């Protein structure tokens, strides 16, 4: 079948598009159109540019540009004037490449912005092409065609024609959406509980004021006649009266009440706030835990919500049975995770329309066209549901509770009462005002900073022993005319620092910033390790505590103003980039557009006016590709200037007057950079790279002074050091603690999670707590020091995993969303460390096994959310899949096709293109079989999946098994001809295939994998 390739030429990918009828290199376009003859003479530069240029055209026009010999091709007009004439011919058409940063006036073009693709347009090669074509053919070649020119190794740059940005693009009733996320993060609390004093339940208080305050629901355009509106207003007045007779005190008291010892905790907190001296430690910890273990549970609050609705809304407003279905769905409305939401169709699809009482029909359209009546009363049931939810359920959950998620549990929800949260607020404003932050008045801040920069905001998330803060900056002041929040202001500086970050891996210390560089360092170290002969290895792990708040303005600004890796003047360019996604080349149905092969991305960059030998001045872009597959670039006219002076002012501001708000009390940080700024993640690594580099001269040479292989990686915090010489790791720990002693930071929980054993008294580190393990667990990793291979750590219980999957499904376009969803979960982590240099074959199989087992459990909630929607009553899927048992077959379809996609991706990520195709076929079938075996053995025991679907899935797995067997049986006869000379990797794969006896049965391989 059509596997994937790791080297292509854009000629093919343009030939295999639909909307294009002609594509070729300009050399053949000239030979065909007879503008030149083969035996002509042109220097190698001009001939090469003629050779690798590409042109495309929607219609074959080799005839229109045939050379009529009537008029000589002798040119006198400059290239600027010919191109002026071209844009002039374009008239009023408004989207072309040569028409970037230029506006026409009458019969005169006017350039007014910077387009760094011109330097290829007004080149000397284009002057030669104008000499060859003559103007009357040029000024039309620059319109009828699409011109790409190879400017990088493979990445073409479009210079003329239409921009591909234009190949990448009756009304109905869209039901409203219930504002769930308004309930989450409140901090208000009044004397007598209830709902807010601005809500209409308490507006200055018959039906008159209800009309005055319900201007958005009473006179909506769904209510046909005045009678419907007035009856609804009557029901709203009845709702209000029936709600104002509730003893919220008692009502809360019954189901979800404060703990039995709440007064003890209030007293303890009041004591810890009164005392002037620095209070205890374990008392505060146990106070935090006793406060966080008082959170209401879903069932109790659900009973509360039912009991508060049953006596605030008349019965016949929804009907006898619709009301009950509503009250039953309300529970699932409560227990949903943070990033989910419930749709009005979920409520409606299980309701009856005639069941309500107060309807009225103008033209008696109920019996003739019943379907129109059903639709035009669903469009009222929906509004009533949304009114009830967004005007009782949401304000109650806002005022009367506090809703958050804990730190380590994941993405679940959590309901704490209100006074308990005011308590934790006071206790944290006390525990906080002593470590880093400090209260501040308004005049302690200057006025320029006051009128230029935005304020801050702080949120608290409960953790196990203590709290955890998180700073938000999204606000922008309404007055003083500021239109940008802090990150929108620092984006330019962050671009400068990105261009700097592209160099810290080898220049001024020890850092990494992604999985590509980490995998690179691993490739190099593992190469050295297999070189010397694979000895015993040791490691060590440790991590700074509160890094972003231990760094001082002085050394930061001093390193910044005294480092030459930041030039003085920088320009900024914006462009669009088009790459090749994973879809294989569809071998040639009649609708194959660009988005089927190319991903669009809208990038920026910051280049230097110097003659840096990367010449971002001539190309316009700087990109890093992983393999030779073509890509396109087009520039844009939106450049800007930036200078180290303004970056200095920015750093000084964000490191001096960082003012953040909390509970209408203004705080100011004392030393450190705020956590939660786009610039911070690079500043921190830069600063600590300075220090760690000045302290670790012994690393650079210890490979040649005594010959000991050893690497040191370091993300923002979590160090990691692997070596063969124990003494190196020991001295490293000592030197790092020395740097911490001298410069003023300290390590978190002293968790020097080393591998060996050593007396920690000989080095004044006795307070450290060694924790000896045998599998180096870095940031979500399982580096195994027996083969030095990598993999990931996966949660292993269905609840553990369920707490981190937010399902959000809508019947609109299932086959798309779900598809990508599952696909994403297969590549979210496997794509990175599947590199074949790190792992052996069996390691690859193990990684695939484990990650498939994890992604099945991550997906499963999606399947059980699907099976709760009936795919019979919808034509879109029933017309194609059938009318009975449509669900299981739809599911079988998406599973099989996503497995084929992921199998292709893995099959090419493991090999080059030079290998035989029978090996790629075998391993194709093997990965597909492993994934299907996992999915079957996990699915053969569920309830909804046991009767029908298991037959199909079993058949599919048996098919894949037989196909594997067929391939591995045929390959030996294929090699019997000697017709292929086996290279090294191929021989290794063949030994992997024969040793494990893939001919008869896969049994020999599962023991070799399933053990974790």
């Amino acid at each position: 079948k059509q596997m994937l390739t790791r080297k292509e030429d854009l000629l093919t990918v343009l030939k295999q598009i639909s909307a294009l009828k002609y594509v070729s290199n300009l050399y053949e376009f000239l030979l065909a159109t007879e503008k030149i003859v083969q035996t002509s003479e042109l220097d190698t530069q001009f001939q090469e540019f003629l050779t690798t240029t590409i042109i495309a055209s929607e219609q074959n026009l080799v005839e229109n540009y045939k050379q009529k010999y009537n008029q000589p091709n002798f040119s006198q007009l400059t290239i600027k004037q010919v191109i002026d004439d071209s844009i002039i011919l374009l008239g009023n058409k408004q989207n072309y490449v040569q028409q970037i940063g230029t506006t026409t006036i009458g019969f005169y073009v006017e350039y007014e912005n910077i387009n760094l693709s011109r330097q290829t347009l007004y080149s000397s090669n284009f002057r030669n092409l104008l000499n060859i074509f003559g103007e009357e053919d040029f000024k039309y070649f620059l319109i009828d065609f699409l011109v790409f020119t190879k400017v990088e190794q493979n990445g073409y740059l479009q210079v003329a024609g239409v921009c591909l940005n234009q190949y990448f693009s009756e009304n109905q009733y869209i039901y409203p959406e219930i504002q769930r996320s308004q309930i989450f993060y409140c901090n208000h609390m009044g004397r007598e509980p209830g709902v807010f004093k601005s809500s209409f339940f308490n507006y200055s208080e018959p039906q008159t004021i209800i009309k005055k305050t319900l201007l958005k629901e009473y006179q909506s355009k769904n209510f046909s006649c005045q009678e419907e509106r007035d009856l609804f207003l009557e029901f709203t007045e009845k709702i209000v009266q029936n709600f104002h007779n509730i003893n919220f005190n008692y009502l809360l008291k019954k189901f979800c009440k404060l703990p039995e010892n709440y007064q003890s905790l209030k007293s303890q907190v009041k004591q810890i706030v009164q005392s002037e001296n620095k209070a205890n430690q374990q008392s505060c910890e146990n106070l935090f835990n006793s406060l966080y273990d008082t959170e209401i549970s879903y069932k109790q609050i659900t009973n509360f919500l039912r009991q508060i609705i049953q006596n605030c809304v008349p019965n016949q407003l929804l009907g006898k049975k619709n009301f009950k279905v509503f009250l039953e769905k309300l529970y699932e409305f409560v227990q949903m995770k943070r990033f989910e939401n419930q749709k009005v169709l979920d409520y409606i699809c299980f309701m009856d329309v005639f069941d309500v009482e107060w309807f009225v029909d103008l033209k008696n359209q109920k019996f003739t066209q019943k379907r129109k009546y059903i639709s035009d009363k669903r469009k009222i049931l929906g509004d009533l549901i949304v009114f009830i939810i967004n005007k009782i359920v949401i304000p109650v959950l806002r005022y009367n509770f506090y809703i958050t998620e804990k730190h380590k549990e994941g993405s679940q929800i959590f309901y704490y009462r209100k006074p308990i949260w005011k308590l934790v607020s006071k206790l944290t404003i006390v525990k906080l005002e002593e470590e880093n932050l400090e209260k501040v008045e308004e005049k302690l801040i200057p006025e320029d900073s006051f009128q230029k920069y935005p304020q801050g905001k702080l949120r608290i998330i409960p953790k196990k022993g203590s709290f955890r803060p998180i700073m938000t900056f999204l606000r922008k002041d309404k007055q003083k005319n500021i239109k940008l929040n802090l990150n929108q202001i620092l984006m330019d500086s962050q671009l400068v620092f990105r261009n700097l970050k592209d160099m810290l891996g080898q220049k001024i210390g020890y850092s990494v910033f992604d999985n590509k560089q980490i995998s690179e360092k691993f490739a190099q170290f593992i190469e050295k390790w297999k070189n010397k002969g694979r000895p015993q290895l040791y490691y060590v792990t440790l991590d700074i505590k509160k890094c972003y708040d231990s760094i001082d303005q002085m050394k930061l600004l001093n390193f910044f103003n005294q480092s030459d890796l930041i030039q003085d003047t920088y320009f900024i360019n914006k462009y669009l980039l088009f790459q090749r996604n994973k879809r294989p080349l569809l071998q040639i149905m009649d609708n194959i557009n660009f988005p089927y092969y190319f991903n669009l991305k809208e990038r920026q960059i910051a280049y230097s006016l110097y003659d840096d030998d990367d010449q971002i001045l001539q190309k316009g872009f700087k990109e890093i590709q992983s393999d030779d597959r073509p890509f396109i670039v087009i520039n844009q006219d939106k450049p800007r200037c930036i200078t180290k002076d303004i970056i200095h002012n920015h750093l000084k501001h964000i490191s001096q007057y960082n003012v953040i708000s909390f509970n209408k009390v203004k705080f100011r940080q004392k030393r450190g950079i705020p956590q939660g700024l786009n610039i911070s993640g690079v500043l921190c690594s830069f600063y600590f790279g300075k220090l760690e580099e000045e302290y670790t001269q012994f690393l650079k040479n210890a490979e040649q002074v005594n010959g000991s292989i050893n690497l040191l990686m370091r993300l923002t915090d979590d160090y990691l050091f692997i070596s063969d010489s124990q003494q190196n790791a020991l001295n490293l720990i000592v030197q790092l603690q020395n740097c911490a002693n001298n410069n003023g930071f300290m390590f978190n929980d002293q968790k020097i999670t080393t591998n060996f054993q050593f007396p920690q008294e000989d080095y004044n580190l006795e307070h450290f707590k060694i924790s000896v393990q045998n599998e180096c667990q870095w940031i979500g990793k399982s580096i195994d020091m027996n083969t030095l291979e990598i993999k990931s750590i996966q949660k292993q219980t269905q609840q553990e995993i369920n707490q981190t999957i937010n399902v959000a499904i809508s019947i609109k376009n299932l086959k798309s969303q779900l598809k990508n969803k599952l696909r994403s979960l297969f590549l979210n982590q496997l794509i990175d460390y599947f590199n074949p240099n790190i792992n052996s074959f069996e390691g690859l199989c193990r990684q695939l096994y484990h990650h498939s087992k994890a992604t099945v459990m991550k997906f499963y909630p999606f399947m059980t959310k699907l099976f709760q929607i009936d795919l019979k009553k919808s034509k879109q899927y029933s017309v194609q899949y059938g009318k009975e048992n449509t669900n299981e077959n739809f599911l079988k379809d998406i599973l099989y096709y996503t497995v084929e996609d992921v199998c292709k991706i893995l099959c090419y990520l493991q090999f080059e293109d030079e290998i035989n195709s029978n090996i790629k076929e075998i391993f194709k079938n093997l990965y597909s079989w492993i994934m299907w075996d996992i999915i079957v053995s996990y699915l053969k025991k569920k309830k909804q999946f046991k009767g029908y679907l298991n037959k199909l899935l079993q058949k599919i797995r048996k098919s894949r098994f037989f196909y594997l067997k067929e391939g591995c049986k045929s390959l030996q006869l294929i090699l019997s001809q000697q017709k292929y000379q086996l290279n090294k990797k191929e021989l290794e794969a063949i030994e992997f295939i024969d040793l494990n006896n893939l001919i008869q049965d896969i049994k020999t391989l599962i023991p070799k994998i399933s053990a974790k």
Binding site: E110, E112, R118, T569, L609, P639, C641
Partner: protein
């Protein structure tokens, strides 16, 4: 395209390279052998050519050139500079697209120059390198100019209309005074 040029803050580069120039000059010529200084002081001959540093490469737009009297015009927003250049070899180096006018170029390396005129010195400017980075054709109305070829008269014009240009005129006056104080 006003902001991209304006935010260069060229006056900083000019002030810093002039400080470098005066410092290097009255640091290199403190012999004060008054006879040798009298032999050095000759009319209309170059005494000192200070090539600016590397980080001071401002980029601006040509509004008008004259080739025989070696006059080039530059501008950025509100200020328009009148400068000189080495020779036509320069323009042959900076690969212009259509015409010397209406083009926006960066400046790889320029230089200050010290001349002796009637009764006093002269601080001249000479652009030694250029490269055209783009075309732009816009009718910029720079309210104020400054000439680096007409002495204190070339700068003191319009000095009362900008704190920046006022302080630059002040630095220029101080520089010529320190020059005539050292060497005379």
């Amino acid at each position: 395209m006003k902001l991209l040029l304006q935010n260069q803050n060229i006056f900083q580069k000019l002030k810093n390279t002039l400080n470098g120039c005066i410092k290097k000059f009255y640091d290199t010529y403190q012999d004060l052998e008054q006879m040798q200084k009298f032999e050095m002081i000759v009319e209309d001959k170059l005494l000192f050519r200070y090539s600016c540093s590397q980080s001071e490469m401002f980029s601006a737009q040509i509004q008008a050139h004259y080739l025989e009297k070696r006059v080039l015009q530059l501008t950025d927003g509100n200020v328009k500079y009148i400068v000189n250049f080495r020779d036509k070899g320069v323009l042959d180096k900076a690969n212009f697209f259509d015409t010397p006018n209406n083009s926006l170029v960066i400046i790889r390396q320029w230089s200050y120059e010290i001349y002796y005129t009637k009764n006093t010195f002269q601080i001249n400017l000479v652009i030694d390198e250029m490269r055209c980075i783009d075309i732009i054709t816009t009718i910029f109305y720079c309210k104020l100019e400054l000439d680096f070829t007409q002495g204190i008269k070339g700068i003191s014009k319009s000095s009362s209309f900008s704190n920046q240009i006022y302080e630059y005129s002040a630095q220029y006056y101080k520089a010529i005074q320190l020059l005539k104080k050292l060497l005379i």
